[model samples]
Target: IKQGIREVILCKDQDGKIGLRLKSIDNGIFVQLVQANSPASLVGLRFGDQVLQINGENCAGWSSDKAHKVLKQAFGEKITMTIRDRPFERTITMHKDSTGHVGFIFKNGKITSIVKDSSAARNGLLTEHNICEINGQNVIGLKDSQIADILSTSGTVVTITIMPAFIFEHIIKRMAPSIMKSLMDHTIPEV
Candidate 1:
């Protein structure tokens, strides 16, 4: 009954997949991905949503492996999830000056720098805010160059949706670290 807490009931698909990937970080389990056209997506589950309970069992500190086991065993049965929506997401509108730059430097979808005395600085855009959308276009999966192209082509005014880098990084690390290689890169050992 608390604010932002909602329950979702999902029926397994023909493939016995609920179509959600979960990741555990810092004692909390969060939704990492929701497969397109899957039960979880249809029911409105999204990345970064924290899983509070499963089938009435508290899952606050549960590991991803344990959650996977529970979900797998519940195939062909109704799965009930108690989830809390991601918080602190914000959208800001900025008007560019003659310079045609919004006054921020972004790399790999994350705002890395905020120029002084510029629209981005004046509009409250900050470094470490991961850009979610620009001009209502989802930029989540686009590469840095693609994002740059969009920004350059976008007109004088732009609207952006962003979330804190910490939360964004958690979702990205579990889903695709390679997309943010500068921030998260690992070298594999040769056997």
Candidate 2:
């Protein structure tokens, strides 16, 4: 069994809550959030894990509402979920110049601009890539100013983890029409 495939058995809490949230994005059901110290969290369920099977039923292409209902109506105290890790996450390290800037501007956790010929451009950080981690810290749910502070204080070298804005936005339910337009307009030119 590959480490990417995780099976979690969850039992409802005293409040009858399993402490998991699911979201459907592009026809794939993904773990949207896991509450702290809950049955889902105790079983190592994480945010962004794609649900493959619930009990013995294939859940691919299931709507979020459907998945929720299935879990709510589960037969027993134990509900088994087979999940796959989220894909296409990339980590890149870049060196800041004397100006103490990584040459990109991010808003609400998504890279909005990249300076020409700068470290971000050279290192392959693309505009609209949502920053997942700054240095070693997860930036999800963080305010823009908080994320900016992390970048500024991350020293001369910083390692960032990012995922495509489209997926990230869908998970958080904040899709931007402009991002879709920019993706078509800013075709990566040949090197």
Candidate 3:
């Protein structure tokens, strides 16, 4: 697992079971638009929200620091927290994206990187390549492992399709199987 994960779990649960889970904040359970500058104070969170669990463990009455410890220990899984409000105690499961990022951390999309001297760089995978798919799976939010695990199987050359839109659609198409397995890199690398 990664060090950052621990910090998140601990921070989310340390405040004790005042009531609430970190997931509530990310999910629309606590707010709508899930964006900033909204009626929800743009922060998308409110007072009284508390954390409950990460990876199926209870975070009852935990200090702020202790809560974070749990988050790291259970990365890439669900973290459920409970919050109290007058007569109701709510449970929220904070789901982690494949990249271990909160869903709200919006990005305008990124360009595919082709390091110099690398295979991608040689195959005209210009810094401009938009790599739309790997062995048919949509590249949307898929981590490298997920891609490889699906692409590599039984000795074969995998086909990766990409349509490069100079002004419309952009992509890439199937690379060798061994190469596909070799090309796949990167992981959560943490708990």
Candidate 4:
């Protein structure tokens, strides 16, 4: 992790009720504030530190609720976290079918649109998917030209993984009708 363009690591204390104010931005949870001398403060967690992993699970694409649930489960557990001082990165795949197009539009590294009847649309790519990978190359913070280079690489069958945070909620919301209220309670699972 970097603070002002430098790497930072938090290793002292990993537990203490995580008494810090957190907010979700683009799926990654950030430490918005740390109480004086609190566990988070003592551990050197500061504002803008992005929590990238929890207990070996990749939190890079986790939403606030998912992180909350994971934390709740982590109660009484010696949790391990990997954090960074940068924005979370993610990616989506684009395919060139018989029509010769991937069928998606990009804006600021996000998939802003999917063509009405393009390969991407038929392949179930969502509009909000963030493109973090191209042809298996990590492009978490790369430019459009760089991404495009990989897109046109090889035979043109792109395989990008959508950020998990964007898909989980939508899937749950759609499946709510089939879920039980007792199981549907907003309770975070403990480790």
- lDDT tens string, model 1, 1-191? 12489999999998898887787877878876666567887777655678888898888788899988888988467999999875446778998879788899988788999899989999989888888667655467667897888888888999887889987776667555444332211111112
* Steric clash pairs (candidate 1): none
Worst 10 residues of 3 by lDDT: 27-36
Q: Ten-residue segment with the worst summed lDDT in candidate 2?
A: 181-190
User: Which has the better TM-score: candidate 1, or candidate 3?
Assistant: 1
The residue ranges of model 1 lying beyond 4 angstroms of the native Cα positions read 1-3, 88-90, 93-101, 133-138, 149-159, 174-191
Task: Quote each prediction's TM-score.
Answer: 0.73, 0.72, 0.23, 0.39
Which candidate leads the pack in TM-score? Answer: 1
Clash pairs, model 2 backbone: none
| Candidate 4 colliding pairs | 73-189, 73-190, 73-191, 90-132, 91-132, 92-160, 93-160
RMSD of each: 7.9, 9.0, 18.9, 14.6
Q: Using alpha carbons, what is the TM-score of model 1?
A: 0.73
* C-alpha lDDT values of all predictions: 0.75, 0.73, 0.30, 0.54
Number of clashing pairs per prediction, in order? 0, 0, 42, 7
Q: How would you encode candidate 4's per-residue C-alpha lDDT over 122-143 as one tens digit per residue?
A: 7788766665345443343445
Instruction: Kindly report the root-mean-square deviation of model 1 from the true structure over all alpha carbons.
Output: 7.9
